[PDB]
Amino acid sequence: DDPLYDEAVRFVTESRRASISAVQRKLKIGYNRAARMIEAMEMAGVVTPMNTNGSREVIAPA
Amino acid sequence: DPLYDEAVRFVTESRRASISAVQRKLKIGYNRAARMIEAMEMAGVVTPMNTNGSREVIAPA
Amino acid sequence: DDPLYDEAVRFVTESRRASISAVQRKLKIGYNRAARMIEAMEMAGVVTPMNTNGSREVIAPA
DNA sequence: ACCAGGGCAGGGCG
DNA sequence: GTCGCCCTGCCCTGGT
């Protein structure tokens, strides 16, 4: 539902970075907003769940 | 970034170009500090990273 | 004026270890928080600046 | 009442 | 074992 969602998924899948932090940097948005889009990406199988140390890997092809 | 000149002044005086040093100095987060180091690199104030990961400051103090 | 500064100073001066990492572990604080306090100790003459070889020494007595 | 980003601790690396 | 720095996620300030 976020206007930036499509752009966030593009960034994530092109850059191969699945971090909330990286999205915040690229789109100049806050933690809550970026976290929600990442959670949507997880919910939609674009991005992995995080492992114990918080890192995720990009599922979707670029 | 409105703090760009301050960051430039900091690195050119200290000769330190770590993201973290700038982040602490300017009381800012990692993302904003990284962005500023990137701007300094694009403006020739500091070098890009070498093999290990360290930058040199090119601008005079 | 970090609340934990005096505590950090007592640990550094007792241990003779002027290290950001040792303070992190001793106090259970983040890297930047510990680094800020080491920097503060440098400016106050409690520890030396970082040497060109990396190292730091404690100046102040225990 | 909103919301970017700075407060926090620390894992993963050279 | 040790070190410092990059970059992370999570929590809550700061602000016109």
The angstrom resolution of this structure is: 1.9
The experimental technique behind this entry is X-ray
Work out the angle between the directed axes of helices B4-14 and B19-26 (0-180°, nearest 10): 120
DSSP calls for A7-32: HHHHHHHHH----HHHHHHHHT--HH
Query: Which CATH number belongs to the domain containing residue C18 in this structure?
Result: 1.10.10.10
Separation of CA A31 and C1' E16 in angstroms?
22
3-class secondary-structure state, position B56 = coil
Separation of CA A61 and C1' D7 in angstroms?
36
Residue A1 lies in domain: 1-59
Residue of C nearest to B16 (CA): C50
Work out the angle between the directed axes of helices C31-43 and B19-26 (0-180°, nearest 10): 70
Tokens of C24: 């992190």
3-class secondary-structure state, position A47 = strand
Q: Which CA distances in Å does B43 have to B29, B58, C6?
A: 21, 10, 41
As for how many domains chain C has, the answer is: 1
d(CA B43, CA B36): 10
Cα C18 to the center of its chain, rounded Å: 5
